[PDB]
Coordinates of C-alpha atoms in Angstrom, one line a residue:
Chain A
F1 CA 0.0 0.0 -0.1
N2 CA 3.0 2.2 0.7
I3 CA 4.0 4.9 3.0
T4 CA 7.0 6.6 1.4
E5 CA 4.9 7.2 -1.5
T6 CA 2.3 8.9 0.5
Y7 CA 4.7 11.3 1.9
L8 CA 6.1 12.3 -1.3
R9 CA 2.6 13.0 -2.5
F10 CA 3.1 16.2 -0.2
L11 CA 5.0 18.6 -2.8
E12 CA 2.8 21.7 -3.3
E13 CA 0.9 21.2 0.0
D14 CA 2.8 21.4 3.3
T15 CA 2.7 24.4 6.1
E16 CA -0.2 23.4 7.3
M17 CA 0.2 19.5 7.5
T18 CA 3.7 19.6 9.0
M19 CA 6.3 17.2 7.7
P20 CA 6.1 14.6 10.8
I21 CA 2.0 15.0 11.2
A22 CA 2.0 14.4 7.7
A23 CA 3.9 10.9 8.0
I24 CA 1.8 10.3 11.4
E25 CA -1.5 10.5 9.4
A26 CA 0.5 8.2 6.9
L27 CA 1.0 5.7 9.7
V28 CA -2.4 5.6 10.9
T29 CA -3.9 5.0 7.3
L30 CA -1.6 2.0 6.6
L31 CA -2.6 0.8 10.3
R32 CA -6.6 1.0 9.8
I33 CA -6.6 -1.1 6.7
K34 CA -5.0 -4.6 7.4
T35 CA -6.9 -4.8 11.0
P36 CA -5.4 -3.1 14.3
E37 CA -7.1 -6.1 15.9
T38 CA -3.8 -8.6 15.6
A39 CA -0.7 -7.3 17.5
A40 CA 1.4 -9.6 15.8
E41 CA 0.4 -9.1 12.3
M42 CA 0.0 -5.1 12.4
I43 CA 2.8 -3.9 14.8
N44 CA 5.6 -6.0 12.9
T45 CA 4.9 -4.6 9.6
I46 CA 4.2 -1.1 11.2
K47 CA 8.1 -1.6 12.4
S48 CA 9.3 -2.9 8.9
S49 CA 7.4 0.0 7.1
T50 CA 9.3 2.6 9.7
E51 CA 12.6 0.7 8.6
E52 CA 11.8 1.0 5.3
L53 CA 11.5 4.9 5.4
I54 CA 14.6 5.3 7.6
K55 CA 16.3 3.5 4.6
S56 CA 14.8 5.8 2.2
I57 CA 15.7 8.9 4.3
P58 CA 18.8 11.0 3.5
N59 CA 18.7 13.9 5.7
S60 CA 15.7 13.9 7.9
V61 CA 15.2 13.4 11.8
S62 CA 11.9 14.4 12.9
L63 CA 10.3 11.6 11.1
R64 CA 12.1 9.0 12.9
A65 CA 10.8 11.0 16.3
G66 CA 7.1 11.2 15.1
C67 CA 6.8 7.4 14.8
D68 CA 8.0 6.8 18.5
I69 CA 4.9 9.0 19.7
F70 CA 2.4 7.3 17.7
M71 CA 3.8 3.8 18.9
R72 CA 3.8 4.9 22.2
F73 CA -0.2 6.1 22.1
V74 CA -1.1 3.0 20.2
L75 CA 0.9 0.6 23.3
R76 CA -1.0 3.0 25.8
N77 CA -4.5 2.4 24.4
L78 CA -5.3 -1.0 25.5
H79 CA -3.4 -0.4 28.6
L80 CA -6.8 -0.3 30.6
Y81 CA -7.5 -4.1 29.2
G82 CA -10.4 -2.7 27.6
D83 CA -12.7 -4.1 24.9
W84 CA -10.6 -5.0 21.8
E85 CA -12.8 -2.6 19.7
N86 CA -13.6 0.6 21.5
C87 CA -10.1 0.9 22.1
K88 CA -9.3 0.0 18.4
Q89 CA -12.1 2.8 17.2
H90 CA -10.4 5.3 19.5
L91 CA -6.9 4.6 17.8
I92 CA -8.0 5.0 14.2
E93 CA -9.6 8.0 15.2
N94 CA -6.5 9.7 16.8
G95 CA -4.9 10.2 13.5
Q96 CA -6.9 13.0 12.3
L97 CA -7.2 14.2 15.9
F98 CA -3.1 14.2 15.9
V99 CA -3.4 16.5 12.9
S100 CA -5.8 18.6 14.2
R101 CA -3.9 19.1 17.3
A102 CA -1.2 20.6 15.2
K103 CA -3.7 23.5 14.7
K104 CA -4.7 23.9 18.4
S105 CA -1.1 23.7 19.6
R106 CA -0.1 26.4 17.0
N107 CA -3.1 28.7 18.3
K108 CA -1.7 28.2 22.1
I109 CA 2.1 28.9 21.3
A110 CA 1.4 32.2 19.0
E111 CA -0.3 33.8 22.0
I112 CA 2.1 32.6 24.4
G113 CA 5.1 33.3 22.7
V114 CA 4.5 37.0 21.7
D115 CA 5.3 38.1 25.1
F116 CA 9.1 37.3 24.7
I117 CA 9.2 40.2 22.0
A118 CA 9.4 43.2 24.0
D119 CA 8.7 47.2 23.0
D120 CA 10.8 47.9 19.7
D121 CA 13.7 45.0 20.0
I122 CA 15.9 44.3 17.0
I123 CA 15.7 40.6 16.3
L124 CA 18.3 38.2 14.5
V125 CA 16.3 35.2 13.0
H126 CA 18.0 32.0 12.2
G127 CA 16.5 28.8 10.4
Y128 CA 12.8 28.3 9.5
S129 CA 10.6 26.6 11.5
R130 CA 6.5 27.0 11.3
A131 CA 6.5 28.1 15.0
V132 CA 9.0 30.5 15.2
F133 CA 7.6 32.4 11.8
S134 CA 3.9 32.0 13.5
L135 CA 5.2 34.0 16.5
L136 CA 6.4 36.6 14.1
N137 CA 3.1 36.9 12.3
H138 CA 1.0 36.8 15.1
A139 CA 2.8 39.4 17.0
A140 CA 2.3 41.8 13.7
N141 CA -1.3 40.8 14.0
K142 CA -0.8 42.1 17.5
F143 CA 0.3 45.2 16.4
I144 CA 3.7 45.1 18.2
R145 CA 7.5 47.0 17.1
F146 CA 9.7 44.6 15.9
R147 CA 12.9 44.7 13.5
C148 CA 14.4 41.4 11.7
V149 CA 17.5 40.5 10.6
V150 CA 18.0 37.7 7.8
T151 CA 20.9 35.1 8.2
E152 CA 22.4 33.7 5.0
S153 CA 22.0 30.2 5.9
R154 CA 23.2 27.8 3.4
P155 CA 21.4 24.6 2.8
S156 CA 19.3 24.8 -0.2
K157 CA 19.3 28.4 0.2
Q158 CA 17.0 29.3 3.2
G159 CA 18.0 32.9 4.0
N160 CA 16.4 34.2 0.5
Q161 CA 13.4 31.9 1.1
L162 CA 13.0 33.5 4.8
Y163 CA 13.7 36.8 3.2
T164 CA 10.8 36.6 0.5
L165 CA 8.4 35.2 3.4
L166 CA 9.2 38.1 5.3
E167 CA 8.3 40.8 2.5
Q168 CA 4.8 39.1 1.8
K169 CA 4.3 40.2 5.7
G170 CA 5.5 44.0 5.9
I171 CA 8.3 43.9 8.3
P172 CA 11.8 45.8 7.6
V173 CA 14.3 43.6 6.6
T174 CA 17.8 42.9 5.3
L175 CA 20.3 40.3 4.4
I176 CA 22.9 39.1 6.9
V177 CA 25.7 36.7 5.8
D178 CA 26.5 33.8 8.7
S179 CA 30.5 34.9 8.2
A180 CA 29.8 38.4 9.6
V181 CA 26.9 37.1 12.1
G182 CA 29.5 37.8 14.6
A183 CA 29.4 41.8 13.8
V184 CA 25.8 42.2 14.3
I185 CA 25.7 41.2 18.0
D186 CA 25.4 44.6 19.7
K187 CA 22.7 46.0 17.4
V188 CA 20.6 43.0 18.1
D189 CA 18.4 42.5 21.1
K190 CA 17.7 39.1 20.7
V191 CA 18.8 36.0 18.6
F192 CA 16.1 33.1 17.6
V193 CA 16.3 29.9 16.2
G194 CA 14.0 27.2 14.8
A195 CA 15.2 23.5 15.5
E196 CA 15.0 20.4 13.4
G197 CA 15.3 18.4 16.7
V198 CA 15.8 18.7 20.5
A199 CA 18.3 16.5 22.4
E200 CA 17.7 14.3 25.3
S201 CA 20.5 16.0 26.9
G202 CA 19.0 19.5 26.2
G203 CA 20.8 20.3 23.3
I204 CA 19.8 21.0 19.7
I205 CA 19.5 19.2 16.2
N206 CA 20.0 22.2 13.4
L207 CA 21.1 23.6 10.4
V208 CA 24.3 24.4 8.7
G209 CA 25.3 26.9 11.0
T210 CA 23.5 27.2 14.7
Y211 CA 26.1 26.0 17.1
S212 CA 28.4 29.1 15.9
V213 CA 25.3 31.3 16.5
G214 CA 24.8 29.9 20.1
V215 CA 28.6 30.3 21.1
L216 CA 28.9 33.9 19.4
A217 CA 25.7 35.1 21.4
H218 CA 26.9 33.4 24.7
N219 CA 30.1 35.5 24.1
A220 CA 27.9 38.9 23.9
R221 CA 25.9 37.7 26.7
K222 CA 22.6 38.2 24.2
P223 CA 19.6 35.6 24.5
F224 CA 19.3 32.7 22.3
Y225 CA 16.1 31.3 21.6
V226 CA 14.5 27.8 20.3
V227 CA 10.9 27.7 19.3
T228 CA 9.2 24.7 17.9
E229 CA 6.1 22.5 18.0
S230 CA 6.0 19.7 20.7
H231 CA 6.8 16.2 18.5
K232 CA 10.5 16.7 17.7
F233 CA 12.0 14.8 20.6
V234 CA 14.1 11.9 19.7
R235 CA 15.9 9.6 22.5
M236 CA 19.1 10.6 20.7
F237 CA 22.3 11.7 22.8
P238 CA 25.3 13.4 20.4
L239 CA 28.0 12.5 22.8
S240 CA 30.5 15.4 21.0
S241 CA 30.2 18.3 18.9
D242 CA 30.4 16.5 15.5
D243 CA 28.5 13.4 15.7
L244 CA 25.2 12.7 14.0
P245 CA 23.2 10.1 11.9
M246 CA 24.4 10.9 8.3
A247 CA 23.5 8.8 5.0
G248 CA 25.9 11.3 3.2
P249 CA 29.7 13.1 4.1
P250 CA 30.9 13.1 7.6
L251 CA 33.7 15.6 6.4
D252 CA 35.6 14.1 3.3
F253 CA 38.6 15.4 2.1
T254 CA 39.2 14.9 -1.9
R255 CA 41.8 14.5 -4.3
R256 CA 43.6 16.9 -6.8
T257 CA 41.1 17.9 -9.2
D258 CA 41.5 20.5 -12.1
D259 CA 37.7 20.5 -13.7
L260 CA 36.5 21.7 -10.0
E261 CA 33.8 19.4 -9.2
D262 CA 34.3 17.8 -6.1
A263 CA 34.1 20.5 -3.3
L264 CA 31.2 21.6 -1.4
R265 CA 31.2 18.6 1.3
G266 CA 31.2 20.2 4.7
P267 CA 28.6 19.1 8.0
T268 CA 25.4 20.2 6.7
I269 CA 23.7 19.4 10.3
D270 CA 25.5 20.6 13.4
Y271 CA 24.7 20.3 17.1
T272 CA 25.0 22.8 20.0
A273 CA 25.3 22.0 23.9
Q274 CA 22.6 22.4 26.6
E275 CA 24.5 25.9 28.1
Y276 CA 24.1 28.0 25.1
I277 CA 20.0 27.9 25.0
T278 CA 18.7 30.5 27.1
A279 CA 15.2 29.8 26.6
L280 CA 13.1 27.3 24.8
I281 CA 9.2 27.5 23.8
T282 CA 6.6 24.3 22.9
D283 CA 2.7 24.3 23.4
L284 CA 3.8 22.0 26.5
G285 CA 4.1 25.4 28.6
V286 CA 7.2 27.4 29.0
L287 CA 9.9 25.2 29.9
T288 CA 14.1 25.1 28.6
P289 CA 16.7 23.2 30.6
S290 CA 16.1 19.7 32.3
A291 CA 12.4 19.9 30.5
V292 CA 13.0 18.0 27.6
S293 CA 14.7 14.9 29.4
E294 CA 11.6 14.8 31.8
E295 CA 9.3 14.8 28.9
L296 CA 11.2 11.8 27.4
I297 CA 11.6 10.0 30.7
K298 CA 7.6 10.6 31.3
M299 CA 6.8 8.8 27.4
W300 CA 9.7 6.2 27.2
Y301 CA 9.0 5.1 31.1
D302 CA 12.5 4.3 31.3
Chain B
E1 CA -9.9 59.6 67.3
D2 CA -12.0 57.6 64.7
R3 CA -14.8 58.8 62.8
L4 CA -13.7 61.5 60.4
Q5 CA -15.9 63.8 58.1
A6 CA -14.7 65.8 55.0
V7 CA -15.6 69.0 53.2
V8 CA -14.1 69.6 49.6
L9 CA -14.3 73.0 48.2
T10 CA -15.2 72.6 44.7
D11 CA -16.5 75.6 42.4
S12 CA -14.0 77.7 43.7
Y13 CA -11.1 78.7 41.5
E14 CA -13.2 78.4 37.8
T15 CA -12.2 80.8 35.2
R16 CA -8.8 81.3 37.0
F17 CA -8.5 78.5 34.3
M18 CA -9.2 80.8 31.2
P19 CA -10.1 79.3 28.0
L20 CA -11.6 76.5 29.7
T21 CA -14.3 75.8 32.6
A22 CA -17.0 77.3 29.9
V23 CA -19.3 73.9 29.3
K24 CA -17.6 71.5 32.0
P25 CA -16.7 71.9 35.6
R26 CA -13.1 72.9 37.2
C27 CA -12.3 69.5 38.8
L28 CA -13.5 67.3 36.2
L29 CA -10.3 68.0 34.2
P30 CA -7.8 65.3 33.7
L31 CA -4.1 65.7 35.3
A32 CA -3.0 62.1 34.0
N33 CA -5.9 61.1 32.0
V34 CA -7.7 60.7 35.2
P35 CA -10.0 63.5 36.7
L36 CA -8.6 65.7 39.5
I37 CA -11.1 64.7 41.9
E38 CA -9.8 61.1 41.9
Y39 CA -6.6 62.3 43.1
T40 CA -8.2 64.3 46.0
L41 CA -10.8 61.3 46.9
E42 CA -7.7 58.9 47.1
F43 CA -5.9 61.3 49.3
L44 CA -9.3 61.2 51.4
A45 CA -9.5 57.3 51.5
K46 CA -5.5 57.3 52.5
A47 CA -6.3 59.8 55.5
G48 CA -9.6 57.6 56.7
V49 CA -12.4 59.8 55.9
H50 CA -16.0 58.4 56.8
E51 CA -18.4 60.9 55.5
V52 CA -17.7 63.3 52.3
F53 CA -19.1 66.6 51.5
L54 CA -18.8 68.6 48.2
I55 CA -19.7 72.0 47.2
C56 CA -21.6 72.3 43.5
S57 CA -23.6 75.0 41.7
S58 CA -22.0 76.0 38.4
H59 CA -22.1 72.6 36.1
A60 CA -23.5 70.6 39.2
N61 CA -25.4 68.2 37.2
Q62 CA -22.4 66.8 35.4
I63 CA -20.7 66.5 39.1
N64 CA -23.7 64.7 40.5
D65 CA -23.5 62.4 37.5
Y66 CA -20.1 61.7 37.7
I67 CA -20.3 60.6 41.4
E68 CA -23.1 58.6 40.5
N69 CA -20.6 56.7 38.0
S70 CA -18.0 56.7 40.8
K71 CA -16.6 53.8 42.9
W72 CA -18.1 55.6 46.1
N73 CA -21.7 55.1 45.5
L74 CA -21.0 51.4 45.7
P75 CA -21.9 50.1 49.3
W76 CA -18.2 48.6 50.2
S77 CA -16.8 52.2 50.2
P78 CA -15.4 53.9 53.2
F79 CA -17.2 57.1 52.8
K80 CA -20.2 58.5 51.3
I81 CA -20.9 61.4 49.3
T82 CA -23.3 64.2 49.9
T83 CA -23.4 67.1 47.7
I84 CA -24.1 70.9 48.8
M85 CA -26.1 72.8 46.1
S86 CA -25.8 76.5 46.7
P87 CA -26.7 79.7 44.9
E88 CA -24.3 80.3 41.5
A89 CA -20.9 81.6 42.9
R90 CA -20.2 82.5 45.9
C91 CA -17.4 83.3 48.5
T92 CA -16.1 80.4 51.1
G93 CA -17.5 82.3 54.0
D94 CA -21.0 82.4 52.4
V95 CA -21.0 78.3 52.1
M96 CA -19.4 78.2 55.6
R97 CA -22.3 80.0 57.0
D98 CA -24.8 77.7 55.0
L99 CA -23.1 74.5 56.4
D100 CA -23.4 75.8 59.9
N101 CA -27.3 76.8 59.4
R102 CA -27.7 73.0 58.3
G103 CA -25.3 71.8 61.2
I104 CA -23.8 68.5 60.2
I105 CA -20.2 69.6 61.8
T106 CA -18.9 67.0 64.6
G107 CA -15.7 67.3 66.7
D108 CA -12.7 67.9 63.9
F109 CA -13.5 68.3 60.2
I110 CA -11.6 68.6 57.2
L111 CA -11.7 71.3 54.6
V112 CA -9.8 71.3 51.4
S113 CA -9.7 74.2 48.9
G114 CA -8.7 73.1 45.3
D115 CA -7.5 69.8 44.2
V116 CA -4.2 68.9 45.6
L117 CA -1.8 65.4 45.0
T118 CA 0.5 64.5 47.8
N119 CA 2.5 61.5 48.9
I120 CA 2.4 62.9 52.4
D121 CA 0.8 60.3 55.0
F122 CA -2.0 62.4 57.0
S123 CA -1.8 59.9 60.3
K124 CA 1.1 61.9 61.4
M125 CA -0.6 64.9 60.8
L126 CA -3.8 64.2 62.8
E127 CA -1.3 62.9 65.7
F128 CA 0.5 66.5 65.8
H129 CA -2.9 68.3 65.4
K130 CA -4.3 66.5 68.5
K131 CA -1.1 66.8 70.6
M132 CA -1.1 70.8 70.2
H133 CA -4.8 70.8 71.0
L134 CA -4.3 69.2 74.3
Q135 CA -1.8 71.8 74.6
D136 CA -4.1 74.7 75.0
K137 CA -7.8 74.7 75.1
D138 CA -8.4 77.7 72.3
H139 CA -6.8 76.2 69.3
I140 CA -8.4 76.3 66.1
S141 CA -7.1 75.2 62.5
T142 CA -4.3 73.1 61.0
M143 CA -2.5 74.4 57.6
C144 CA 0.1 72.3 55.5
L145 CA 3.3 73.4 54.1
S146 CA 6.1 71.9 52.0
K147 CA 9.8 72.8 50.8
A148 CA 9.8 74.7 47.6
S149 CA 12.3 74.0 44.5
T150 CA 15.2 76.0 46.1
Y151 CA 14.1 79.3 44.9
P152 CA 10.8 80.3 44.1
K153 CA 11.7 82.6 41.1
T154 CA 9.3 80.9 38.4
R155 CA 6.6 80.7 41.2
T156 CA 4.9 84.3 40.5
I157 CA 1.2 83.2 41.3
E158 CA 1.9 82.2 45.0
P159 CA 4.0 85.1 46.6
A160 CA 2.7 84.1 50.2
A161 CA 5.7 85.1 52.8
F162 CA 5.3 83.1 56.0
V163 CA 6.5 84.0 59.4
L164 CA 6.5 81.2 61.5
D165 CA 7.6 80.0 65.3
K166 CA 10.9 77.8 65.8
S167 CA 9.4 76.5 68.8
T168 CA 5.2 76.2 68.4
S169 CA 5.2 76.6 64.7
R170 CA 2.2 79.2 64.8
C171 CA 2.1 81.6 61.8
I172 CA 2.3 85.3 62.4
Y173 CA 1.8 86.9 58.7
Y174 CA 0.6 86.2 55.5
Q175 CA 1.8 88.5 52.4
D176 CA 1.2 88.6 48.8
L177 CA 4.1 90.2 46.3
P178 CA 4.2 91.4 42.8
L179 CA 8.0 91.5 43.0
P180 CA 9.3 90.0 39.8
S181 CA 6.3 90.3 37.5
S182 CA 5.7 93.8 38.6
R183 CA 8.3 95.9 40.2
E184 CA 6.3 98.5 41.9
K185 CA 6.0 97.8 45.5
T186 CA 8.9 96.5 48.2
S187 CA 7.7 97.1 51.3
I188 CA 5.9 94.7 53.9
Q189 CA 4.6 96.0 57.2
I190 CA 4.5 93.4 60.1
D191 CA 2.4 94.3 63.3
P192 CA 4.4 94.4 66.5
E193 CA 2.3 93.1 68.9
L194 CA 3.8 89.4 69.2
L195 CA 7.4 90.2 69.7
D196 CA 8.6 89.0 72.9
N197 CA 5.9 86.1 73.0
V198 CA 7.4 84.4 70.2
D199 CA 11.1 85.5 70.4
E200 CA 12.4 83.2 67.5
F201 CA 11.0 84.8 64.5
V202 CA 11.3 83.2 61.2
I203 CA 10.4 84.6 57.8
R204 CA 10.2 82.5 55.0
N205 CA 8.9 82.9 51.3
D206 CA 10.4 79.4 50.2
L207 CA 7.2 77.4 50.9
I208 CA 4.3 76.3 48.6
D209 CA 0.7 76.6 49.7
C210 CA -1.3 73.7 50.1
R211 CA -4.8 74.9 51.5
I212 CA -5.6 71.6 53.2
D213 CA -7.1 72.1 56.8
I214 CA -7.9 70.3 59.7
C215 CA -10.5 72.4 61.6
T216 CA -12.2 72.1 64.8
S217 CA -16.2 72.6 65.9
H218 CA -15.1 76.7 66.2
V219 CA -14.8 77.6 62.8
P220 CA -18.4 77.6 61.3
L221 CA -19.6 79.7 64.4
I222 CA -16.5 82.2 63.6
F223 CA -17.8 82.5 60.3
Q224 CA -21.3 83.1 61.3
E225 CA -20.5 85.7 64.0
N226 CA -17.9 87.5 61.8
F227 CA -19.6 87.5 58.4
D228 CA -17.3 89.9 56.9
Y229 CA -14.6 87.3 56.4
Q230 CA -15.2 86.2 52.7
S231 CA -11.7 84.5 52.2
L232 CA -10.1 81.6 54.2
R233 CA -6.4 82.6 54.0
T234 CA -5.7 86.5 52.9
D235 CA -8.1 88.1 55.4
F236 CA -9.2 85.3 57.6
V237 CA -5.6 84.2 59.1
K238 CA -4.4 87.5 59.5
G239 CA -7.7 88.4 61.3
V240 CA -7.4 85.6 63.7
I241 CA -3.8 86.4 64.3
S242 CA -4.4 89.9 64.9
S243 CA -6.3 90.0 68.5
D244 CA -9.9 89.4 67.5
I245 CA -10.5 86.9 69.9
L246 CA -7.5 86.9 72.5
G247 CA -5.8 83.5 73.2
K248 CA -6.4 81.8 69.8
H249 CA -4.1 79.7 67.9
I250 CA -3.7 78.5 64.3
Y251 CA -1.3 75.8 63.3
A252 CA 1.4 75.8 60.4
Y253 CA 3.1 72.5 59.5
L254 CA 6.3 71.7 57.9
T255 CA 6.7 68.7 55.5
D256 CA 9.6 68.0 53.6
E257 CA 7.9 65.5 51.1
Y258 CA 6.2 66.7 48.0
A259 CA 2.4 68.8 48.2
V260 CA 1.4 71.0 45.8
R261 CA -2.0 72.5 45.2
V262 CA -3.3 73.0 41.8
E263 CA -4.3 76.4 40.8
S264 CA -2.7 78.1 37.4
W265 CA -2.1 76.5 34.1
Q266 CA 1.7 76.7 34.3
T267 CA 1.8 75.3 38.0
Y268 CA -0.4 72.3 36.5
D269 CA 2.2 71.8 33.8
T270 CA 4.9 71.3 36.7
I271 CA 2.7 69.1 38.7
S272 CA 2.2 67.1 35.6
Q273 CA 6.0 66.8 34.9
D274 CA 6.6 65.7 38.4
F275 CA 4.1 63.0 38.2
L276 CA 5.4 62.0 34.9
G277 CA 8.9 61.8 37.0
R278 CA 9.2 59.9 40.3
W279 CA 8.5 62.8 42.5
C280 CA 5.1 61.0 44.2
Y281 CA 6.7 57.5 45.0
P282 CA 3.1 56.2 45.6
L283 CA 1.2 58.3 43.5
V284 CA 2.4 56.5 40.0
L285 CA 0.5 55.9 36.9
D286 CA 1.6 52.4 36.9
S287 CA -0.3 51.4 40.4
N288 CA -3.7 52.2 38.8
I289 CA -6.4 53.7 41.0
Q290 CA -9.5 54.0 38.8
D291 CA -9.4 50.1 38.2
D292 CA -10.3 50.9 34.4
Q293 CA -6.4 51.8 34.2
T294 CA -3.8 49.3 32.7
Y295 CA -0.7 51.6 32.7
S296 CA 2.5 49.8 32.9
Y297 CA 5.9 51.5 33.7
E298 CA 9.0 51.3 31.1
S299 CA 12.4 52.2 31.6
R300 CA 13.4 56.0 30.9
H301 CA 10.2 57.3 32.4
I302 CA 8.0 56.1 29.1
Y303 CA 4.3 55.3 30.5
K304 CA 2.1 53.1 28.5
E305 CA -1.5 51.4 28.9
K306 CA -2.7 47.7 27.9
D307 CA -4.0 48.0 23.9
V308 CA -0.9 50.8 22.9
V309 CA -0.6 51.0 19.1
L310 CA 2.4 52.5 17.4
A311 CA 4.1 52.5 13.8
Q312 CA 7.6 50.9 13.3
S313 CA 10.4 53.2 13.4
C314 CA 9.1 55.9 15.8
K315 CA 11.0 57.6 18.7
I316 CA 9.8 57.8 22.1
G317 CA 11.5 60.5 24.6
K318 CA 11.7 61.0 28.3
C319 CA 8.9 61.3 30.7
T320 CA 5.8 60.4 28.5
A321 CA 2.6 58.8 28.9
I322 CA 0.0 57.5 26.4
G323 CA -3.3 56.2 27.1
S324 CA -5.4 53.0 25.9
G325 CA -6.6 52.2 22.3
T326 CA -4.6 54.9 20.8
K327 CA -2.8 54.6 17.4
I328 CA 0.3 56.4 16.3
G329 CA 1.7 56.9 12.7
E330 CA 5.2 57.1 11.4
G331 CA 8.1 59.5 11.8
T332 CA 6.8 60.7 15.2
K333 CA 9.0 62.2 18.0

């Protein structure tokens, strides 16, 4: 029936259906066909489909995290030894209810996380997450004064994409390069970030230059922010500064070339430690330091 | 010591404010986006008043309707407001005789002319009034005074010179002077009847008037007896001192903290700038007294209420206050 193909169908869609929430909705559809009455036939085939999904993954982390929460909810269903049928109907229904919860959470955060941006504050924003930009838009809806500084992130050129999406709103902007990002931290009140994942330790899984931002801000004593939707938690503990799950290059040094083809190769995803984050924002209240681990301990019961 | 009644002199300094007071009353006007009466009423509540009196005649209907809407018509209030309706525009002496004819004054009563905002605790004042009343029987009224801004060279409307005792703090003389605005008069003549009774004479012009009074039951009886007295400061105080009834005393109270009565436009402007600054430590916009107020303090003395709307790239200054539901455009200072 396929799950990778269902995820590939979301091309011109996105924005509303968040990348993990669309993968979770795809997991529920695959579950509801071949009877969730059996726990040997279904769960094993769900595990095989997640393994097939991980094997097809090039540079995504959040899809593995979202699977875990689904699994957890499924197991928790019939924890009351309830009827093998009303528990099943509640499990199938919690697929569309899971996607509907992404809207309700965004409604919560955009009213909570506008408080952090005070009267007339210049912001240097890095990365693009649907939660952080929704704060930025619904603060403009709240009629609050804020300036914006764009970071030239280099994955699939994200800075230019961010700049254009800020133009459509009506907020004054200018391009700042990630090389010169050190020379900006004096005319900037606060530094904001959108994460691809949040660590078990309390650190962050992010883009092509975020640790560098974290350290410079720690030097300048200027605050460093992480805002996300509460589903990007993996049981992952990157022990060192340069160790992450990869399908491509972990720093490759190429031979002598004349035509110039083999060059680009650098760490596209980088980790930053727990100390560098001043504040973290999700729908699960306002919490930063040891909070992430407590969430993971509560979920995994281990 | 408990049970205290207060009388407020409104309809008193009208047309002293020249372009205004045409349609709406004197005391309705806001200092910091809130009526002048509200400040006075807050001073009454902090003092400990159980019964409130107000004097309304000109634009009296608008005053009465404002009291109806006020936070004191509601049963939980420590004081109840009763309005005195008199003939249109009369002197303070005429109102004093009217109130004595009605006869509500019991023991020690309060009289305030104009609207005064002060941070000075009144509990100390009452005690020192009572301590001095126990000193001798024939003792009348209490007057408040505060230290001026070093030199009163900009203060021309209030040129009141006070002669005071170092030991008993009794007032001797009151005098008005045209001096810096109109260079015509220089001379001040003083009565030499009280020379060796006092000995420690202290003459000062460096004191601000307050016109806030703690008064005994003697006062309304004296006003009816001597109906020639129209004023309460210029003729009355001087008349009391200059052997009208022998052995009668009046108080003068010195206080280091801020207490300024509103009277003129340029005095009002200074008081307002003092309120925007942190001169009146308790009396600040952020505390919110009118209940509808939602002001919040920001650094560099900038006040903003809730629902403040402002355009981007706009500069705000020092000692500023902006109300609720307010919109501002670009390029504003």
